Amino acid sequence: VRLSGEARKQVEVFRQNLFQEAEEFLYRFLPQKIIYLNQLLQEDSLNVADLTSLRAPLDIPLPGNEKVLSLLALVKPEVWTLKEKCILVITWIQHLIPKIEDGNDFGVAIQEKVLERVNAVKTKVEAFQTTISKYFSERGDAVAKASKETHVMDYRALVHERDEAAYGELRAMVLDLRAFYAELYHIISSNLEKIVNPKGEEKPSMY
Amino acid sequence: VRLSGEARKQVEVFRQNLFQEAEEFLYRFLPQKIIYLNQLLQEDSLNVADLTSLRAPLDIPKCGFLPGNEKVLSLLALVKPEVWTLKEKCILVITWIQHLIPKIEDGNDFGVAIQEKVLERVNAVKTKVEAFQTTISKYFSERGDAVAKASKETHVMDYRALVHERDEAAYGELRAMVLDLRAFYAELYHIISSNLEKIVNPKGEEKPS
Amino acid sequence: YDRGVNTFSPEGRLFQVEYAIEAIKLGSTAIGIQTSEGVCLAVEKRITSPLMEPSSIEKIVEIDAHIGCAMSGLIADAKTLIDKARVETQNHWFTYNETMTVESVTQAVSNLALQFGEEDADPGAMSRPFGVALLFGGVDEKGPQLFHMDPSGTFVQCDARAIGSASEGAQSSLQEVYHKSMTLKEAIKSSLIILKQVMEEKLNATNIELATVQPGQNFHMFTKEELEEVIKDI
Amino acid sequence: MSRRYDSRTTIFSPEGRLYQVEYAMEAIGHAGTCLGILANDGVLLAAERRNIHKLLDEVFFSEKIYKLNEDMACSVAGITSDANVLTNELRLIAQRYLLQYQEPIPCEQLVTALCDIKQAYTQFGGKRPFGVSLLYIGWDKHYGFQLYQSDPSGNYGGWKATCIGNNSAAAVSMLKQDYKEGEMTLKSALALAIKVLNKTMDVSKLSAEKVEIATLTRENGKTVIRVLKQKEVEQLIKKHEEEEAK
Amino acid sequence: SFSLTTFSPSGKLVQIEYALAAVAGGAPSVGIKAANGVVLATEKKQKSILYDERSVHKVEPITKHIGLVYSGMGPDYRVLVHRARKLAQQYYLVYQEPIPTAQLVQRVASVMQEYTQSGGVRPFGVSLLICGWNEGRPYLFQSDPSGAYFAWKATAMGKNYVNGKTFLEKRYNEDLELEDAIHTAILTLKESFEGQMTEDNIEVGICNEAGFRRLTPTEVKDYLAA
Amino acid sequence: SYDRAITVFSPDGHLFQVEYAQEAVKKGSTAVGVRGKDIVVLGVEKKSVAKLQDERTVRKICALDDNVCMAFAGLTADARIVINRARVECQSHRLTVEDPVTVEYITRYIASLKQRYTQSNGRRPFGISALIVGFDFDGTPRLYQTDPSGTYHAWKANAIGRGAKSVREFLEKNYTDEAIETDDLTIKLVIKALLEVVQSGGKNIELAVMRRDQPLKILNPEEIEKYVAEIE
Amino acid sequence: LRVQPEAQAKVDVFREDLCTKTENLLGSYFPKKISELDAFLKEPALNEANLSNLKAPLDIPVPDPGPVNCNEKIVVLLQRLKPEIKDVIEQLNLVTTWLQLQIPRIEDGNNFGVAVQEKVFELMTSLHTKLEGFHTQISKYFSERGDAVTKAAKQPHVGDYRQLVHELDEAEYRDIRLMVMEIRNAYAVLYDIILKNFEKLKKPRGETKGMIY
Amino acid sequence: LRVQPEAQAKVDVFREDLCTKTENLLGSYFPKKISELDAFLKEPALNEANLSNLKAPLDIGPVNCNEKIVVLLQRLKPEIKDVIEQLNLVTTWLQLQIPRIEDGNNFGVAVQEKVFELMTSLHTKLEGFHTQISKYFSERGDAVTKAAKQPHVGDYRQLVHELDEAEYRDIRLMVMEIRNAYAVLYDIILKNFEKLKKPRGETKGMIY
Amino acid sequence: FDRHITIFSPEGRLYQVEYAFKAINQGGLTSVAVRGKDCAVIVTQKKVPDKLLDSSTVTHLFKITENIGCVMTGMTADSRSQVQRARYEAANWKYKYGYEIPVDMLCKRIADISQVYTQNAEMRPLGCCMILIGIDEEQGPQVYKCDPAGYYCGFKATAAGVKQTESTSFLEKKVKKKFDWTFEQTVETAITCLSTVLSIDFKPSEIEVGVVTVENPKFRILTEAEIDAHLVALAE
């Protein structure tokens, strides 16, 4: 290749040290965060289906609801942290991609199928993050339009509908979030042998 | 999985009720609704040839109450229940065919492919029925916002000229929908009746093994 | 690969044989000459390296004293056909005690070329057509005769026919220069002019090979004597 | 007929290799781990048994170890069905040799005779190739003690020590390190097989039943071949049992 | 005229891999080698009561001292009966002696090897259990569609062989009488086969010093006392 | 039996099967050979084994007869069939004609086989390219190269296998009348021809020589190192 | 990756937890909620013959030469339906997670058992698309009705404004009867999808097998 | 067409310039540039654990946002533009290395196209990163304006505090996306380079 | 791929052989046969599409040998092929072993011929099932049915065709009662079977009835005049 002989060995930081750093997250970080979200799922505030108990009082001819923000304080770091770990898995697969060849590419197809499912999980948590910012935008615009509404009790009462739906969706997010930690490790650990060594690197001359 | 005896009965009663409903769908519901809309098409209510007299011109101003079209509003009382009914019945047909899916095998699956083609043809009808629900809510949103817009604008009259077109476009669509709904009843009849052999019994179970 | 050898095209052509005639466009440029005083054949050796000996490679070989040869495209395909062509040529004299006419030479080669096939035959049969364009000249009691043959297997009496990569513009150029009674020495002139123009390399005694046949003089392979003379007498 | 289903083994890949032959070498790697050693006092052969169950019997002399002729033997790793085809053809070639020259066939001649038959199906015929890899041991009048390894492509070569089947990269690496060229003989080097077979087997506590060992040595002008006693191989393993402590 | 068996990218044989998949989808079959004899038990399941049981038997003798059973495609087993019987007679011509079990199954499996190689012929969809008695040594062998024959003290195959092997990990002991081994094989098929257990459905045969002898339904009824 | 065409044409006219055959030729080890003045010398690189293989079966320089020897570069599989059946022709030619074999006579019958294997039904073109070299009558040496396609050429200096074009560049540049002057300079040229494609190979070079009336002689590893000792 | 006897068991127990829940869903939870949604649809509130019964009275006098509210019945019917929607979506994702935990290593041999799991997965995502949309549709019916009521009181002239308010009342009412029938059927549909193939869904390839090929 | 040893060679020089850059980028620029983003992500400003302090309080003129977060946006923006430039240089270089179109020996051409298609994912994402940053300005500017329009709703102040964290969260994501944009791309080029820069050709058949 | 030629399916099935089983079923003719104590009877559907067709020119009852009858159900193209091939065997049996071929070996040899069609991929299975009858001096009446797959077994009561499912059920109902076996009363059972399934009451020319007895080992075809006697007069 006649490339410069300096800094060439600096790739071993990301190809090994960072490569092994992503390994420690699969069998250690991910299972420990599953038990952590279990403590979040055991919270009794997620099991309340009563509208009046969930929604905060609102006086309009502006009181908000801070109980959902306390849930968002738990949901936002957890959903957003797993995205980085999924991004690290994407790069973790990139280092394991063998050089271009015709035969023995079945191991490459495994890496393509696993990484495609990681992008699917990355999209699901990304749609969750967009929705997280939508709770304040929709509720803020709901009470804003309802602030001008006086004779209409219909739209003013329907503002609390997204307040109740926020509790059911965030519970569905954390429940689906907890599965994403287990599904990420389950898919990788199964094919781990063929993912790390997609071709067992065995070539005989004979000819 | 494990389950109790009541679990099978709750499903079995659903299997029996949905089967008897699907049987009354093909040989009762469909032949009744085909001639039902055919009588409505021949009825002078939907048979009006003159679309210019069906329009409801409104004044352009204690402002006087501006009603909608008496003809369109009265004919939607016939159209709207038929749109909701066919959508509800197709769902029972889509679901009942899904229960007829045999245990999935990796070969001799063409019996399943027949049911897949039937579901796609019913899904195409269900999509057009949902488009009819939009058309019903379209005339009320288009005529409503425009007439007040034609009311607040006294300089531009031709807004009402489009309102006159909403009356003709609706009656054209009101008759076109029930004409398509009757066609949908006829399409669901010929597709299910001719394919009834492979829909109910997709697999003969002749396997000697 | 998703097609057969004998499969007909919607335009009435063979997939196999069409690519045969399409394959010969990559061969070496060679031209035959038929004159009233004899037959002349020239061929470009197309040597890819000085270490490769141009004398060992021969695209013109002697079947009978009258008949010469020509080669283009894949060389070994021609060698396979010339082998049996020399066997049946001596089988002629072994029976009739006479030299085989130029026409009977191509008739034996046309039969061997038409036998191409795969199924319903023995393993000792040629499966695919040859990528060679054949030129068979010679002089007999009937006089000088030059025939042209392509992968199809036909043979037609012609004054001059161009083969190889340059056969497109050469065959039209051979038409213009060659006419009427033009003889051997006058044929070598226009031959080496058109060949040197179309090929990349300049004319040299070792870059091409030339041989002629006359009524009184049998097939004579030109050595360094005759080759170095005709290139400077061009 | 139906050229649609014709795989055409004779077709070369765009990389310039054979489809079936490349997949044949992988199928051999899934088989059991088998090794061999060429020493001064004779040839050494040891083979693991991947089949492990309480109902196994193996009434024969050995599973993966066979006897070609008086002066030669063989091992096998690969498809177990096509091994009996090659074993019979080796016995046919060796005996047809005894007809003409009335002498035992040399080691190199019998090996190259079957390899021509192995690759003859890869050259033509349309029949699938063989997925069997064979090890060869024995003694001949000239070259003496010999050890040979074969490949499914028909290629082969001489070897002082080698390994076939599973754990090929690990065993051969462990073989070379302690291998003593023309030095360590049957007695001593027999402890290496047990040492290697214990490392190649992922399950600890190497059992004498899970492995098989056979040797061939010519003594007093007569070739002697035998399958080692499992009771003694246990004591031969009892050596390795006390090796990590002392 | 071309062999359709090719090497998978993982090295497995695809045609033979699905050959055993057809064997596992057939009727269960078991066998036990204990004491002076070897027992083979199969389950014959008809499609109705309108089919004669005694007309066609799954247990068939090869020679005096050898017999075979099968689980898999029925017609594929009839080809092996003609080729195994004819091979044993060609043996008796040369050596004028009864054929040993090891020699028979070798060249019989070679027929399986030929049709997994020669073109235009599919591999066999059957797997056979080999029972033989020679020179005082009981011989129980198991053959597969690929042609690989092994040696087993006891074995299970066909359907529910996993639970059948589990029973052989316990119910099968050493120094076991042949008569007790027959009832032991019945306890093995007790869980597998359901419905009405009769003497006609089960088909059992044995081989001992007196040679291979097939058992009659009347004798089996006495052996069903358990 | 198995009867169908294997090698077929293409829309551009080139042969898919044959080009992949010559590709496997280049994938093999690098072998070289030259035609000396009074002798002939062959050589081929050895992939470095680690303390295992025996050099008896690994040797890629063979001899078809006392007059003619050969070397090969490519798949080792198809090489042994050609060597065997060519030696049969060498004895068959002496059986048919009392006169000894001719290098040009034996060479053409070899490459003619590969031509038959290409156009025969069900057969396959070989992945080998062999260098046929020997002595003709009066002692005139001849060096010929085969082709999987069935053609054969004549070469004064030749290189086959991996990097055959790379060594050929060294040949055409450094081949002069100074080359193959004497038995020593002929051998040293073969060594230097193997020094371009060698990466830290060293002693892996094995050589062979045939001297006049004598049959092919293998240079001992120490005799090889004697000529290899001089580089700079 | 390192072997953890605990951290790895956290995923295994999580899989075994979904196995026990799935058996409770198919056997108990699903048949119980089918009968509840059946009586909820057959309820006289949703059994109303004429759609004009649930038209919400709104007094907005047109100028002749104000109090505005919603329909109390529709809100309660939607208040009862939303918990069943949140329950069917969360449990469907648990069943979807359970099947993905049953997916073995990716190999060509006997991969058609996984292909059955792929078809079952596509059928659950088709249900997930419909069920998640119904949760969004009701959220849309809130904004569409609340805005139409505002526009009706904004321009008390055109009769289509006060009519569109009553039409959305009829629309949401029939929409409730559809969505209840969907979830009630989705229990039995997913029940029939799993139970028929449960032999090959729980066991994609055999159990433990192989001949040492 | 004819041959122009001057004007046509200026195109070959433009290719030899990109070929000289490509080897200089792989051996020098890329290994250093990839490492610069590592220390950029390890910066304590991007490692901040508690985002409650970075929430910008709104006074409800006295209107402003968090300046520290804007500086974090001003630090990441050049790194987003740096990879877009390097992405276009490699995309152009891959197109100029495409040989002539032929039916046979086209496998290497498909290999060059396979690596070329891996760049398309980066063309879209890198433009969506900068567009998303500019979209945050309008979202946070309108949220304060809507709060300044109707002085009632307090959720807009919480919406700005959410968008204050929403930016910082996406910054740490984009920094990892930018670093992976160099690192993965640098590995893909090395995985297909050495003997596969000219996959086929320069080999031929000894004869024709 | 596996659904076209004969190769092992991933589930262990053979689709080329199973599509043949639907090809016998595709013929549109239902055949039944019952093995009695002293006799074996065959009753099949005799269809005459047009009046221009002739009776004796189209028949489903063929004679392999004098003592063995044969009935065929399927596409007639494969029907005549096996019968000629069977006569090349049954006759060859006498040239070698010197006696009338038994029904056991006749079904074994015909199966082996059909087994090669499944094993050899060059050929195809045949689209007609074969039911062979006869009598031996030991087991008495013999009734076998050979599928194109090559399997055959002794059947007390067998059936084939579209109504085979409904035909087998009624054949079970008669045997479940331990129906007394006599010659002509069994002929009714085979005729009443097809009569109750289709609910028609066929005409004498619409059925084809073969018979074989202990007293007459030579195969015979029941006269259509005698068919009319036992249809109308005895429906009871």
UniProtKB/Swiss-Prot annotation, chain B:
GO terms for biological process: regulation of G1/S transition of mitotic cell cycle; regulation of proteasomal protein catabolic process. Keywords: Acetylation, Phosphoprotein, Proteasome. One of its GO terms (cellular component) is extracellular exosome. GO terms for molecular function: endopeptidase activator activity; identical protein binding. Induction: By IFNG/IFN-gamma. The modification Phosphoserine is found at S4. It holds the Pfam family PA28_C. Disulfide bonds: none annotated. It comes from the Eukaryota. Implicated in immunoproteasome assembly and required for efficient antigen processing. The PA28 activator complex enhances the generation of class I binding peptides by altering the cleavage pattern of the proteasome. PANTHER family: PROTEASOME ACTIVATOR COMPLEX SUBUNIT 2, PROTEASOME REGULATOR PA28. Belongs to the PA28 family. Heterodimer of PSME1 and PSME2, which forms a hexameric ring. This is Proteasome activator complex subunit 2. It comes from Homo sapiens (Human). The lineage of its organism: Eukaryota, Metazoa, Chordata, Craniata, Vertebrata.
From Swiss-Prot, chain D:
The keyword Transit peptide does not apply. The modification Phosphoserine is found at S13, S75, S173. The modification N6-acetyllysine is found at K127, K176. It holds the Pfam family Proteasome. InterPro entries: Ntn_hydrolases_N, Proteasome_alpha, Proteasome_alpha-type, Proteasome_asu_N, Proteasome_bsu_CS, Proteasome_sua/b. It is found in: Cytoplasm; Nucleus. Keywords: Acetylation, Cytoplasm, Nucleus, Phosphoprotein, Proteasome. It comes from the Eukaryota. The keyword Phosphoprotein applies. GO terms for biological process: proteasome-mediated ubiquitin-dependent protein catabolic process. The 26S proteasome consists of a 20S proteasome core and two 19S regulatory subunits. The 20S proteasome core is a barrel-shaped complex made of 28 subunits that are arranged in four stacked rings. The two outer rings are each formed by seven alpha subunits, and the two inner rings are formed by seven beta subunits. The proteolytic activity is exerted by three beta-subunits PSMB5, PSMB6 and PSMB7. This is Proteasome subunit alpha type-4. The gene is PSMA4.
Swiss-Prot record, chain G:
InterPro entries: PA28_C, PA28_C_sf, PA28_N_sf, Proteasome_activ_PA28, Proteasome_activ_PA28_N, Proteasome_activ_sf. Keywords: Proteasome. The keyword Iron-sulfur does not apply. It comes from the Eukaryota. SUPFAM superfamilies: Proteasome activator. The keyword Glycoprotein does not apply. One of its GO terms (biological process) is antigen processing and presentation of exogenous antigen. GO terms for molecular function: endopeptidase activator activity. Transmembrane segments: none annotated. Pfam families: PA28_C (PF02252), PA28_N (PF02251). Induction: By IFNG/IFN-gamma. GO terms for cellular component: cytoplasm; cytosol; extracellular exosome; nucleoplasm; proteasome activator complex; proteasome complex. Implicated in immunoproteasome assembly and required for efficient antigen processing. The PA28 activator complex enhances the generation of class I binding peptides by altering the cleavage pattern of the proteasome. Heterodimer of PSME1 and PSME2, which forms a hexameric ring. PSME1 can form homoheptamers. Belongs to the PA28 family. This is Proteasome activator complex subunit 1.
Curated annotation (Swiss-Prot), chain I:
CDD domains: proteasome_alpha_type_6. Belongs to the peptidase T1A family. One of its GO terms (cellular component) is P-body. The keyword Signal does not apply. PROSITE patterns: PROTEASOME_ALPHA_1 (PS00388), PROTEASOME_ALPHA_2 (PS51475). The 26S proteasome consists of a 20S proteasome core and two 19S regulatory subunits. The 20S proteasome core is a barrel-shaped complex made of 28 subunits that are arranged in four stacked rings. The two outer rings are each formed by seven alpha subunits, and the two inner rings are formed by seven beta subunits. The proteolytic activity is exerted by three beta-subunits PSMB5, PSMB6 and PSMB7. Interacts with ALKBH4. It comes from the Eukaryota. The modification Phosphotyrosine is found at Y151. The modification N6-acetyllysine is found at K94, K96. It holds the Pfam family Proteasome_A_N. It comes from Bos taurus. Keywords: Acetylation, Cytoplasm, Glycoprotein, Nucleus, Phosphoprotein, Proteasome. Gene3D superfamilies: Glutamine Phosphoribosylpyrophosphate, subunit 1, domain 1. InterPro entries: Ntn_hydrolases_N (IPR029055), Proteasome_alpha (IPR050115), Proteasome_alpha-type (IPR023332), Proteasome_asu_N (IPR000426), Proteasome_sua/b (IPR001353), Proteasome_subunit_alpha6 (IPR034642). The modification Phosphoserine is found at S9, S55, S56. Transmembrane segments: none annotated. Coiled coil: none annotated. It is found in: Cytoplasm; Nucleus. This is Proteasome subunit alpha type-6. The keyword Zinc does not apply. GO terms for biological process: proteasome-mediated ubiquitin-dependent protein catabolic process.
